[PDB]
Structure formats: structure tokens, C-alpha cells
Amino acid sequence: KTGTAEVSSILEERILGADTSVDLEETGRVLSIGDGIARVHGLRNVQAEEMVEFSSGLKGMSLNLEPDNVGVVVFGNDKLIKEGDIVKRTGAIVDVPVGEELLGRVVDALGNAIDGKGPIGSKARRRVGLKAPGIIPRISVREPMQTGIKAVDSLVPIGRGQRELIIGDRQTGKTSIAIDTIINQKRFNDGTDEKKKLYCIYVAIGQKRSTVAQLVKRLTDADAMKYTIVVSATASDAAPLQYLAPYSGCSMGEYFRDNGKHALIIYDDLSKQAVAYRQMSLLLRRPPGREAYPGDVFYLHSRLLERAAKMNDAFGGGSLTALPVIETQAGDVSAYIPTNVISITDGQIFLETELFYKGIRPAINVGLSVSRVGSAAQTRAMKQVAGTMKLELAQYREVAAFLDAATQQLLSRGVRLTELLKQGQYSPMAIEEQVAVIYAGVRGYLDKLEPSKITKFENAFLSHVISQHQALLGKIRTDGKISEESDAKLKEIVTNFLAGFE
């Protein structure tokens, strides 16, 4: 055998008693930096998972408190660390700044602003290694989280506190759905009722830094940044930073959840966190598993996605939604990580790639997409419409494998509905316009339009109702349900508009 603190440079200090001069209860010396981990000697008073600070300004956290030398993961590039450097405690479990002083800022995985707009002047520091709310604090998911996308709001409704899952092959429309959901909250974030305002957090993990820069620019182009945080552990950043980024974001969101406000965190994407964690492990010699992922690449996500809860009135009534993104490989949604995360969340949104090639954007595959919990949380107008839209599409999907006029009718209905469900990009529509268009579609009025022409009808229709009939939409929204008189109106308006469209 041998030892790791049994080196000459240490045994000499100990032999001639010189250790009385250098502190070891509050300061250590890096025995060896390698493979992104530093074996550090000293730090007798370091708590597990404390956040120690190196002598180059770096920062790491102590994982292994081996009997003779701590083991420290460096949140950065070890290029800057040299055997012999002095590591100092900080007496604080690894934590991150929180508050509303972060809103509109870009911060790296540790809360250090990287947009060059000055320090994050926050007061509260919240741990990252916190526990999720227990059984009792939570209650069911009741309010809706308006996505602003026709398909998501109609067929895969999302509540608040519900962990969704945007899972689908790369270059399919996942980041696009996230950006639509983040821009669609502008309307709610310009009122007074704190029951509606939703503060968004976007964690960009292992994602090209140019892409995150363009995303921030696109958000600020729509003043959807005054209320968003953007945590960024991009591709270049050392693996430990890509490992903490989701926990930093989830803590910055828990700060809201615990204070009666509603947040919405988008991990983009957890698969790259899992890859970074596998790197971190295999460089610590830990055993590999299935696909070389460590044994605990499930207690890596669960302890993160279990914090996206829905507090009850006793604890504040807060919330923290979550929309983890996942990039399946070619078509396998049975791989290790897609399955490990499909069994942690309360829903799924499958973005098929064939649909995306065939021009059906968003590519949301229905049938494979469910929201087990969102049905209880859905505006009753959208329920009055979806209850039948889902049925019509379900019937259509059976007759899509092949006729008498019955199946021709069903095919026509299905094609019309799917042609409606397409949508642009960065153009989310309030729920009232969604009910208007989906109603005018499901109730057959578009049966007499050439399929390709629906793609235009919708557009025009929106304008005609965004101006002429503000009052009807106002009544629908305020009452939340299509009142029978409101149904009669919507009917006569759709008929009149359809009359002379061509």
C-alpha cells in the first residue's frame, strides 16, 4: 500500500515540527491537482461540501473528506492551480446569491454576472444542496401556466409546479418552445395580481455560448428580460460548472417558490448535465454503470426535479414549474437517461423529427405526449374546446393508417386540425385567441377550406378578432369559460368572417 499525504514535502514539515507555523485547521496546501480534482492537505475544520477558495481566486467544493487529505472539485479550469497553492475555507456550504436583484442578469453557474453590467447586488444567499419540500407542504396543481403554444396549451396542458419534459432529437424545436413559454409571460407580468406573474429562469448547460448570447439578445428584443434570469454553464466551462448550473438555477427559483411567488425554470438540457457528471465521476475512478454513467445518475436528477413543487397556502402558495429538456439520440426514448428522467417528471412533450421535416412546426407529437397532472389545471374555455379537439384527433389517428364518407370526414377533420396546430416562432398567442381559433376549427367551419389555405385563414382571422371583437375576448378571459351567449357570438362572428374570406 501507500498514502497520499505520505509525501516527502509533508513528512519533512512534520518531522522537524515546522507544522506549528502553518495553519491546518483553517487552511490547506494543494497536494496534487489533476484530472480536474485537487487532493488538498489540511483543512481539518472543513465541512463536507463546503465551498473552499484557492489561491488563484478559483473556487471549489470539498467532496471526499478522506482521513488525511480533503478532495476538492474545482469550479473552473485547473490550469490555474498548482501543487503547493494555499486553499482557504469559506465556512459556508456551497451556496449562491438569490433575490430579485438577479432579474434581467446573466450569471454563470455560481452567481457571478458575465454580461459585464456590474455586480449582482443581492443580499440573500441560498444553498444549492437543499432538500425538496416534503409530502405535506405540497398540494395539487391548480393554476395553469399558459405556454402560448397552441399544441401545448390544447393537448398537453401544463399546470404550475408540474415538471414537464421537452424530450426529442436534436434540432427539433425544444429551445424554441422554451423561448415561446418565456416570452408569453410578458402579458401576465404587466399587471398587479401576484397570482399571475411568472418569473422565468433559463439554465443553459453545455450549450454553445454564441447560442446563449443570441438567446439573450432575442429575449431583450421583446423586453422579456426584465423578469428572466439566465444561468449559463456553456460548453467550454469546466464540467463541475455544468454540474452545478441546474442546482444554481433551481435555488434561484426556490427563493421565489418559498416567498409566495411563481417561477418557471427551464433546464437546457439535463442530458448534458448527466454527461458532465459522468465525466466528473470517471475522473474520480468511481465505477461505471450502464453506458458508463455512474450508479447515481438518477439521484442526480431526482434531487433536482423534486424541488419543482407547488407549495400550499400554509407555506406561501408559491410554485416552481420546470421544463427539463432532453436530447434523445436518433429515436431511442428507452435509453438510460431519457428513461431515468421520464420516470421523474409528471408529463412529457415528444418532439418527433419526422413531423419536423414534414413542416409541422412545432413538431409536438401527440399520443406520445401526455400531461398527467395538467388536466386538473386548465382554463374551462380551453377545456370546453380541447375535450373535443383531443377526441377528434384521436379518431383521426386511427383512420390515418389507410373509403366511405365517414373515414373521409374524419380524415378531413384531422387534417384541418393539424394544419391549425402549426405556429410561427416567437409569436405566442394569448389563450383567448387560442380558444377562438381552435373553436372555429373543431366546430367544422373550416371543413370547407382547402387544407393548405388554413395556414392563411388562421393568420387573417386573428387580426379580424384582435381589433373588431376585443369585447368578446375580454368576456371570455374574465369569465374564463365560453358562456352560452359567448358561444353564440363566436359562432356568428366566425360565420360572418368565413363568408367572404376566399
Binding site: 455560448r209 448570447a213 464540467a239 448534458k272 436518433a330
Partner: protein, 467 residues
């Protein structure tokens, strides 16, 4: 500071400094060789010893030789005098033309541009090639990926991109030959000398070749793409201009990384690749971006092992690619050169928010007509031309005309076809295709367009060959 070697295990040396260690990634000179042996630190093993990966053959090293610490990572010359030269990974010329006399030096290990530097507007790099600039537009500071094998005109396309970028955008280029066969390295050198991108007489060369041969130890095939990146970062930063960067190949970059990781003893990852595959690729693909000073485009050849597009190497590369250019053999039999396939070539910026509505509608129309013609090809082959109506024969005629018009005569390829090089600007390509689709030229013989530049030259060729 002078350490001493204490172990030589294969291509992994271990040096024992005393006074003060070199931080990771420093380059050490091994004293007492005749060929410059350069080690690069990779770990600290405690006890004032560092495990260095050697950048050249380590036969003849003696436990106890003196290793002198340079002070900063591998440093290379990066002036404009590195243009038209060949230089190995450590920056030593291997063209037998003398020293690379430059006043600047740059370290090959420099961190990626900070977030504030990054430019937020996705532009389009006008390559001057009709098919590329139309269906798969190349983006400034985007990592293009050039599929396709040999025999289909890949070196010619590289030389043409170099020439066109040097003329249009007035920006130089680079060529990092990761694991580059020595025979093909010499052939590429002489091809460039022929075509004139390299020029031995006047110092007006447009390429700065960099070759990490296929026989140099693995530690010196991983750090050659970084040498190319540094030579090009000089042009982006210190001269504010657009740049190309061809990394042939980008699978041998991951292969070299995997071999080095195995040598350092690290546990292998999913498929035997290094545990740091994603970050190793990231810390090199993340310097290829458009800052505000300039930009570094990059055309990276890709090998897909066993046609596995899920394999961790081509699955980690594709997370960065911003384009694609599937050179195909089936399109070279027809003689349509470049062989670029129009229906496989993707591009992330082919979106009407970026290129513009006109560009996008035209490109999508071309794609749709070509798909429809490919489908009708099957019906014609099976049953016969009779089976088609004129509502289809018109699309067939238009598709044949478009397939012709995509071919272009390259300037460097004058030796083959004799035709003159045509650098058709973007607007001319758009107008030509928008018009050929509008039926405006349904009467001209197809050979009017074959191997022409703009559409006007196609009109002139029709007039000439029609008399």
C-alpha cells in the same frame, strides 16, 4: 527552472522538478536531444513531479535528463509570415524554406471569447458558390461540416472556398491537418501551389497550412487543431477580418484525445472514448466564433465511424455544427461540380428570420421542386415518360434546369474544364433561381445553364449553342 525526467512510460514522460513546478499545460524542452522534443504538462502527482505528454518520439530518453521549463504553453509564431508555410504542431516549419520570421508569438492554449465579446447577430458568409450560398448557407463564425469521401472533389472545394473568401471578404485562411497522411499532405501542398492559393515567389499566399502527421505521437495530434486555431485567432483579433479554418479531419481530433486520455490512465467512457470527450471538443469548438473584432468560420471534415450517427464522436461534433455540405458521388457521375448534394445539405440559418423571406422562399421552392423531381424519377424509371402528364413534365424540366444551374465553374479547377472561374454573388444566385422557377427560361436548352455563373451567362450560352 530545470527539472529532471524520472520516468518514460511509452509516450508519457514524468519529470521531477524541485524549486517550483510549472502550471498544467506548460511546454517543457527536453535538453540533450537533436530534434526539438517538447513535453506538455498534464497533471501534478505530488512530490514536485509532473506527468507530461510528449509531442515527439520518446526513444533515447534517459532517466535523469534535464527538462527546462519554457514558462508558457506551447508557443507558435502567428504573424502574417505564417502564410503559405507549413508548420508542425509546435510551430516549427517543415517546408524546408527556413525559419518563420515573425515578431509575434501566441500560446495555443487560450480561453474562449468571453460572453460580452460574442456577437449577437447571425450573419451569412457569402462563399460565392451557388449551391452552398443558396441551399446550405454558411454562417459567419459557424462550424460547418463537410461530409463525403474522396474522389468527389473535396480538396478542390477547399481550395475554391479559400480563394473565394480571400477575394470577396478579403480574409485569409488556415488549414489544420489533424492526423494528415504524409502522402496526402504533400499532394495538398502541391495542389495549392498549382492552383495558386500558396505562392512561393512573392509572399501573397492565402493559406497557412498546419500539419500534425499521422505518425507523430498522439499527444501531438490533439494539439494541432489548437495550433490552427491560434494562427487564425491572430488574424481575427490582431487584424479584424473573416477567416476560414479547415480541420481535416475532426474525427482524428477525438481519436488523438482518446489515445492521450487512455495513456494518462483515465477510465474510458461510453464507447472507449475519453471521459472528457464533450469538454475536450467544447474547449476547441468554442474559440470558433464571431466576436466583434472579426470571425473564424470553420469547415470541418467529418468521418462517421461505421455510419453510426449516434456514436459519441459524431454525436458530440454535431452538437456544434451550424451547417452541412454532403458531397456525394452520385452527383459527380452526372458531372454536376461541385458534387454538393442539394437535398442532404442542411443549415441551421436557413430560416426566414436570418437569410430573409426572399432567400428562404426561393430555397424552399428549389428544395420542393427537386424532391418532386426525385420522386417522379422513380415513376419515369419504372413505367415511362408517357405515364406523366405535363403538370409533371414541366416540374421535371424545371428540375433538370435547376440541377444544371447549381453546377459552377471554379477558378482553381481551370486545369480540368478550361472554363473561367465565376464568383457569382449572392443576389445573382437568388435572382437566377427565382427566375428559373418562375418559368421565365423554360425554353432554353438545359445545356444553356450547365457550368455557368449568373443566369445572364446562361442566356448567352443558349444563344451561342442555339445557332
Amino acid at each position: 527552472t530545470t527539472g529532471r525526467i524520472v520516468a518514460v512510460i511509452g509516450a508519457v514522460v514524468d519529470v521531477q522538478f524541485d524549486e517550483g513546478l510549472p502550471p498544467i499545460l506548460n511546454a517543457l524542452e527536453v535538453q540533450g536531444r537533436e530534434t526539438r522534443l517538447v513535453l506538455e504538462v498534464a497533471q501534478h502527482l505530488g512530490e514536485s513531479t509532473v506527468r507530461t505528454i510528449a509531442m515527439d518520439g520518446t526513444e533515447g530518453l534517459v532517466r535523469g535528463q534535464k527538462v527546462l521549463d519554457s514558462g508558457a504553453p506551447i508557443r507558435i509564431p502567428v504573424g502574417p509570415e505564417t502564410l503559405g508555410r507549413i508548420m508542425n504542431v509546435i510551430g516549427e516549419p517543415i517546408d524546408e524554406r527556413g525559419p518563420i520570421k515573425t515578431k509575434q508569438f501566441a500560446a495555443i492554449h487560450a480561453e474562449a471569447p468571453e460572453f460580452v465579446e460574442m456577437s449577437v447577430e447571425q450573419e451569412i458568409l457569402v462563399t460565392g458558390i451557388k449551391v452552398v450560398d443558396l441551399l446550405a448557407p454558411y454562417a459567419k463564425g459557424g462550424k460547418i461540416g463537410l461530409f463525403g469521401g474522396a474522389g468527389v472533389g473535396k480538396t478542390v472545394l477547399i481550395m475554391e472556398l479559400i480563394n473565394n473568401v480571400a477575394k470577396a471578404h478579403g480574409g485569409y485562411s488556415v488549414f489544420a491537418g489533424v492526423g494528415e497522411r504524409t502522402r496526402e499532405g504533400n499532394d495538398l501542398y502541391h495542389e495549392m501551389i498549382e492552383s495558386g492559393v500558396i505562392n512561393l515567389k512573392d509572399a501573397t499566399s492565402k493559406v497557412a497550412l498546419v500539419y500534425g502527421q499521422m505518425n507523430e505521437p498522439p499527444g501531438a495530434r490533439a494539439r494541432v487543431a489548437l495550433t490552427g486555431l491560434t494562427v487564425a485567432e491572430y488574424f481575427r483579433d490582431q487584424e479584424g477580418q473573416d477567416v476560414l479554418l479547415f480541420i481535416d479531419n475532426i474525427f482524428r481530433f477525438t481519436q488523438a484525445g482518446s489515445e492521450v486520455s487512455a495513456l494518462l490512465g483515465r477510465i474510458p467512457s461510453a464507447v472507449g472514448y475519453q471521459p472528457t470527450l464533450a469538454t475536450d471538443m467544447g474547449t476547441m469548438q468554442e474559440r470558433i466564433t464571431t466576436t466583434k473584432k472579426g470571425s473564424i468560420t470553420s469547415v470541418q471534415a467529418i468521418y462517421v465511424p461505421a455510419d453510426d450517427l449516434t456514436d459519441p464522436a459524431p454525436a458530440t461534433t454535431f452538437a456544434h455544427l451550424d451547417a452541412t455540405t454532403v458531397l456525394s458521388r452520385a452527383i459527380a457521375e452526372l458531372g454536376i461540380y461541385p458534387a454538393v448534394d442539394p437535398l442532404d445539405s442542411t443549415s441551421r440559418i436557413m430560416d426566414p428570420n436570418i437569410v430573409g423571406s426572399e432567400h428562404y422562399d426561393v430555397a424552399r421552392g428549389v428544395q420542393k421542386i427537386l424532391q418532386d423531381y426525385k420522386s417522379l424519377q422513380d415513376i419515369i424509371a419504372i413505367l415511362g415518360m408517357d405515364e406523366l402528364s405535363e403538370e409533371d413534365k414541366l416540374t421535371v424540366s424545371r428540375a433538370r434546369k435547376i440541377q444544371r444551374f447549381l453546377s459552377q465553374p471554379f477558378q482553381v479547377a481551370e486545369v480540368f474544364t478550361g472554363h473561367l472561374g465565376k464568383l457569382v454573388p449572392l443576389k445573382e444566385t437568388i435572382k437566377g433561381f427565382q427566375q428559373i422557377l418562375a418559368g421565365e427560361y423554360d425554353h432554353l436548352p438545359e445545356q444553356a445553364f450547365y457550368m455557368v455563373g449568373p443566369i445572364e451567362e446562361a442566356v448567352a450560352k443558349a444563344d451561342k449553342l442555339a445557332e
